[PDB]
Design a protein around this ligand. Sequence first.
Ligand SMILES: [Cl-]
Ligand SMILES: [Cl-]
Ligand SMILES: [Fe+3]
Ligand SMILES: [Fe+3]
Ligand SMILES: [Fe+3]
Ligand SMILES: [Fe+3]
Lengths: 200, 200, 200, 200, 238, 238, 238
Amino acid sequence: PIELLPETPSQTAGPYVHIGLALEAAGNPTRDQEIWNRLAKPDAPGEHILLLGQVYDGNGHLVRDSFLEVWQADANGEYQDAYNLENAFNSFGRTATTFDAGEWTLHTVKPGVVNNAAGVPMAPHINISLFARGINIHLHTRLYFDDEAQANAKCPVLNLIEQPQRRETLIAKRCEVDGKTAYRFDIRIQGEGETVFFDF
Amino acid sequence: PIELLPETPSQTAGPYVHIGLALEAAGNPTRDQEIWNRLAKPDAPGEHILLLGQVYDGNGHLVRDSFLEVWQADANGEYQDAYNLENAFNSFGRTATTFDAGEWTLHTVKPGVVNNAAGVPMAPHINISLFARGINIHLHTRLYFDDEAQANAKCPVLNLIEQPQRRETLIAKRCEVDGKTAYRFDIRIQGEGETVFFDF
Amino acid sequence: PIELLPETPSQTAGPYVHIGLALEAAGNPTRDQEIWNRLAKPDAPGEHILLLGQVYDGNGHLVRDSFLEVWQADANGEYQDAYNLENAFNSFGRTATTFDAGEWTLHTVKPGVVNNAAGVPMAPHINISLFARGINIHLHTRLYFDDEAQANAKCPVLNLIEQPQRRETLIAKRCEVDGKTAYRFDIRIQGEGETVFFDF
Amino acid sequence: PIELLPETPSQTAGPYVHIGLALEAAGNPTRDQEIWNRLAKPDAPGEHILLLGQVYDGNGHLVRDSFLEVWQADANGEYQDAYNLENAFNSFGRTATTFDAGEWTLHTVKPGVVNNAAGVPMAPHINISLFARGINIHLHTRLYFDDEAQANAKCPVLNLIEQPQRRETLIAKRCEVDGKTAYRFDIRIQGEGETVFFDF
Amino acid sequence: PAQDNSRFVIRDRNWHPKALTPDYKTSIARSPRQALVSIPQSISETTGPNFSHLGFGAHDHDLLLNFNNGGLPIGERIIVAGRVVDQYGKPVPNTLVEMWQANAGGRYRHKNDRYLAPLDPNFGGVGRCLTDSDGYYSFRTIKPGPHPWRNGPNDWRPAHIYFGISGPSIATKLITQLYFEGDPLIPMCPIVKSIANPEAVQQLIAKLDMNNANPMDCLAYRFDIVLRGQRKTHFENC
Amino acid sequence: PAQDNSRFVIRDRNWHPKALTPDYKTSIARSPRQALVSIPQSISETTGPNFSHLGFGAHDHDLLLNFNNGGLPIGERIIVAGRVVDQYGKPVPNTLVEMWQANAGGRYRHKNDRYLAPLDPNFGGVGRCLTDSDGYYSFRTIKPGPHPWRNGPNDWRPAHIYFGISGPSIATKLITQLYFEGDPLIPMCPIVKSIANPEAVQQLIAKLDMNNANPMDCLAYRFDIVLRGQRKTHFENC
Amino acid sequence: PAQDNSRFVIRDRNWHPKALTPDYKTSIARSPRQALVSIPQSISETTGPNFSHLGFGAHDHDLLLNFNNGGLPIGERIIVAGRVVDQYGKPVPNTLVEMWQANAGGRYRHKNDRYLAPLDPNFGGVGRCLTDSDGYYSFRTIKPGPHPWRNGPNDWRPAHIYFGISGPSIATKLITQLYFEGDPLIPMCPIVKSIANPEAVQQLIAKLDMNNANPMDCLAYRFDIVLRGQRKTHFENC
Ligand SMILES: [Cl-]
Ligand SMILES: [Cl-]
Ligand SMILES: [Fe+3]
Ligand SMILES: [Fe+3]
Ligand SMILES: [Fe+3]
Ligand SMILES: [Fe+3]
């Protein structure tokens, strides 16, 4: 058969990933422009939301050195790929868990609906890639929203998860943090309530 | 790189380990001198204690054919390598689980404090090696004491166990047995509450 | 390590190099345009000079079939790469030793100062490559001028020649020839007074 | 045939040999005890002498980074191998040429006569090993004295040099430096007047 | 805004390291035990950020100068350079390449690194750049030292530099580690050996590159990166 | 008392059998699933008992005479002898070597062995001795027979003798099994094959040793044992 | 005083580098053009200094501590250790071993080195010790960096440490250079290649020695040295 050049193989991002990708977290000075956890300036159209979460290992212990990258549509269901800190909204962001509490946060807007390649609408979602010490190749997941029950039920991606019980692992819980709309999305890498991870 | 002679590889001690190392337990006559589970004669200095325990497999079932070797300091925190049945105290001993109840016992004194190689004091501990059918290479652990909580909290060996919850697996529980101080130390080889095992 | 394509290896230009590169000298008709030993028309700015020299082998005997290529800055210290026989000045030229007397000549202007890559000024020089029967790969040298003694003393290229006595081998001697400024630059390929040759 | 383990191959001592073996010369602080160029305290028996010399390459240029080790009998013709800075005399010493003048010096006594393995007397001599940048394996030579003409004539080592003219290269020249008896011993590594070097 | 107009060759997850590689101890509890759920590529997966307009500082790619506290860092001066291509051999231009590392002594400038080898006051440990229009990147740095770590009782990472590459979509984004030609620690490392196939390990070993060195100044290493092949859609929805 | 003045070469736990080796069925539930925690060597690990003054009976090393109930045991008379050294090749003198085994028919003298082959009234199955000042040990015994066991539906252990060796510390202590040169059961055994590397398996195979045999009396097998290499501490706490 | 009571096996001067090795440019004018004159061994050649009573400071063998100006040097912490033996395999006890080197960046602490890589304020570059009664030596240092030099237009020394060994006589005294396992600069260096026989070059390459490393602290390399064989005289003058 036809063999292409092989892809460069992945390796763990390691416990000191913050040196390269989360400078403040490492304890170091930042550069003039950093790619970080605020996807929306206050003037961005859409519903402004806080996202937060904790990451657990197979023993139910916090993964305190996790690093997350996120990719999401703007409120109108459009992916904005021209990354610029001058923009009111960027579709891409980065965050990391705090070493003491194990909590990450993101500041964004709720994404609009995007169609799959067959033209079927997907429920509102944020694409997440998870990196850490002990993770050899990053884990892909999606964060969906518990207040989108009717869309979630019809999502062609959620519907590829064979067991309905597993679909629940991808649904973030609406709450209020300091009077602001928030959603909690915890990830369990392994064992009871293991988060669905994707290959594509 | 420099390659030395390879070490002879380990194999399981098997279910009939007692033929060689626990003669009475196998059902057989003993020799004039045997290495066994009484490390201290009544005249040894220090606090005389009973140790006892059971060993569990990954399904929560008793490992009834376990064989244990122990190594501990005397009450002054000094290791006594000159093994002699005439001694009031020996630092080394052996025990095995009963085939009916699955319980091992040891009669000893509480060990004194020993520093690590860097001069930092370790909490009082008994070093244990566990052998059995199904165990291809013996498992190393340490028995610490629940009446040493303050010392345990500062032990530089316990502090190498990353999760505090796992450190609890090494703490023996103090009780009274026939009016003498006793500690129970159960070992869980696998699964929930899995005992920490060491490499060194 | 990274290996590139290997360079085509050098070979001697041979005793009949003139057939290809010095047509008159071989005894043959010339073409309409030839690359030869007059770098400057009378109208070129700068000090017009004659250069001449002889080439000696390791036994002190004339190398009568030598072929030389020269490359030099103009009077402003600028290299002129756009070779054109219509130009008042070309930075490149060719010459050859006569078979009877063993002497080559060049008609040019004195070059201006050029800085090395570190911004340090090099004394005025003409870069020379020497080819001949018996020379497997051409020899690189530089012709400096004895009326630039203060500049020569500070040249960072002459200063890479460890022994001061060897630096003297690169200094052409000023004379007058039919009323015009001339310099003699003799080359000794081997032995006593051996000319410095460069690699770069 | 019989093959033993091969000897570790030599390499050049390099231009910075002084870092390891001539600390002051490198520009660096010395240690409490250094092996250096004063073989005799003022109270040593024998004729006190200054030795001095310069080292030339094949082009007649000074070898300014030369390092020399010497080994010689005391005034009574005995080798003193117990090196100790408390001794009145040590048979071993080290010196190096100055970077500006290219001159090395040694302070010692004139050695007494030593017999070869056949019991034949050798003329008074100092054994010298020469190390430097460009010298892949050290060169062995001997320094003899011009005021020992009768002994030199009969030396069984000098007599192994086939050509009498070459013997002259090993004879140091007596002089006076600041009213003190001295001998000059120049070494020519290559070419005219090349110093005899030994293999043994 | 971004458009769905390409597909990316599926990853070979036996070429990449698997999730569960128990000799690398921390992978035991941080590896999923359920199978990954395969999904078809949509605009969500086949698009990604372009960083053409991120503002880079003058020295962002130069670790000899980007943590200047009064002098140069100590250690082996090297250029690390290479090309980013996809599996069809197409260059990946204007893509974000980030890298980070310990100093010459294997000490990381991170609050959580307690290794006893000292920090270097003029070395930070992070670089970033974009590949040029032909897919080439280059960094200048110090060769990092091996680093001991609490895996087995005497485990040492080979000298390594972490790399993050965005590529054209979130489907192509990769983090990996670069190792150095000839390092005798490479065959011994349980993180290197998370990769099962020895030919895949070879793809992470940077080669000494004398042709790119600056004489009397700095050596050079070459590290080429291959991202997932990108092709146009064909015969879809029909 | 004992002192901390030695260090022991770290074990290669891919040379040793791993904990989980599922073809050996009882290992499945008796293997830890969490990683071992590495700790640095201290006096607790680098010391161990010395049995120079344990009292041995006259026949402790001689299984032909140590269970004498009126006659000699039935079976192949053999001497089992060899040297205990560390990985640097240094002999390990005055160290405790214990061995135990089934009889000629593969029956163990243990209340839990219900194999139908008979006990031998003059065979017990345990020996012990100390190595001599040059690291040598020796036993006399009967060659044990193969033993069937309830692993797979037709599994048989090769003839084997268990050995336990103390060495200079609890870090060196080892239990292993000796097998016999040429035994066709060896490559088929799931306990043998708990050891992944075939070269490691070869290290457990005792060789026929005609030079050590007593003519018209008993054969001999040679089994050398290698314990972890022991070195002095250097450059510690500085 | 010293006595003539031994002979030293004659050197193989095709095993050692020859004097004239023109790719190493400075050897061209500093090599004799006349043949060496062979002479028989006498007490002059077969004796040499013994340094038992030279006074060594506490840190003479420890380059991490012997140039302490307020901190540790930057770079890869290593122990360099080995044995000195003669060609008959006999140890060479109580012999002087000296070593010197550049710092982690290839910069020498010598007034004549103007390479642009910085000095390390806590690194000097020199060590010395005596071999013990069994012929072993050890140093602790920083791994030196490669060094560019003005030989060819882009020449770089591999990482190297200079060694000087006295041995029992002036006939055994040697200076050499140690190189490090796997260094890709080794095959390219005109000083290494002054040695014609590639098997001789192998004798200068120190091997990574994990067994001698201090976990979480320093790696180790092993470099054994072989000096000329020493034998008694026999049948001489008869
Ligand atoms: Cl660690
Ligand atoms: Cl140089
Ligand atoms: Fe790392
Ligand atoms: Fe068995
Ligand atoms: Fe021709
Ligand atoms: Fe050097």
